[PDB]
Design a protein around this ligand. Structure first.
Ligand SMILES: NC(=O)c1ccc[n+]([C@@H]2O[C@H](COP(=O)([O-])OP(=O)(O)OC[C@H]3O[C@@H](n4cnc5c(N)ncnc54)[C@H](OP(=O)(O)O)[C@@H]3O)[C@@H](O)[C@H]2O)c1
Ligand SMILES: CCc1nc(N)nc(N)c1C#CCc1cc(-c2ccccc2)ccc1OC
Length: 165
């Protein structure tokens, strides 16, 4: 029924860890630059917890916060309370990025068409996980090694998968 491309944007470790203590377990400035480049000019759909950890509206993008709180407001941001409300807000958009965290990934999992996933080759301590995904009828359309240096101290790869069905 929806017309926009539903893309996931996520970075996870070897065990699907995405978060620890309501924050990111790693610091990879180069990976963040890839995120900014890939998502700029497109709506970011964020779970309420993710948004508050980010702490500010991200410029040059529609920021959409997902919450059950019908009295929730943030200046410079739009608020949605369900998948269907997000779809109404984004009905004329070309592509939207589901930006996390885990609850919001779970929520939009039945609808994802495209996966931008950074895989970090390290096993972090964590408490929040990217959901398991059946990749049947998906194909990898892009893969590239991320920049590892003194500022980016882990080995990681950018992957993009597209759903065929
Ligand atoms: N590495 C990455 O790529 C990445 C990306 C994003 C986030 N993260 C990490 O992931 C963690 C946060 O993930 P999380 O799962 O704890 O939180 P989250 O998904 O970001 O937010 C959870 C909140 O979303 C709202 N929500 C959940 N289900 C809903 C529904 N069905 N309808 C309407 N609203 C709903 C609720 O807000 P209310 O309580 O206000 O009702 C809930 O408390 C953090 O540690 C963050 O750093 C990592
Ligand atoms: C940067 C890892 C990351 N990588 C990927 N591939 N997907 C993601 N969804 C996230 C994530 C995240 C959550 C997150 C994002 C930004 C941010 C800041 C400016 C511009 C864009 C994003 C800041 C803090 C933050 O958590 C404290």
């Amino acid at each position: 029924h929806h017309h926009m491309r539903v893309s996931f944007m996520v970075a996870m470790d070897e065990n699907r860890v995405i978060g620890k203590d309501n924050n990111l377990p790693w610091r990879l400035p180069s990976e963040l630059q890839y995120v900014k480049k890939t998502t700029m000019g497109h709506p970011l759909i964020m779970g309420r917890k993710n948004y508050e950890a980010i702490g500010r509206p991200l410029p040059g993008r529609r920021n959409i916060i997902v919450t059950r709180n019908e009295g929730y407001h943030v200046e410079g941001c739009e608020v949605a309370h369900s998948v269907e409300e997000v779809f109404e807000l984004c009905k004329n958009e070309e592509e939207i990025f589901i930006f996390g965290g885990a609850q919001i990934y779970d929520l939009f999992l039945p609808y994802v068409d495209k996966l931008y996933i950074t895989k970090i080759h390290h096993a972090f301590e964590g408490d929040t996980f990217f959901p398991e995904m059946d990749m049947t009828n998906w194909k990898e359309v892009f893969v590239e090694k991320g920049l590892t240096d003194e500022k980016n101290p882990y080995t990681y790869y950018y992957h993009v998968y597209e759903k065929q069905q």
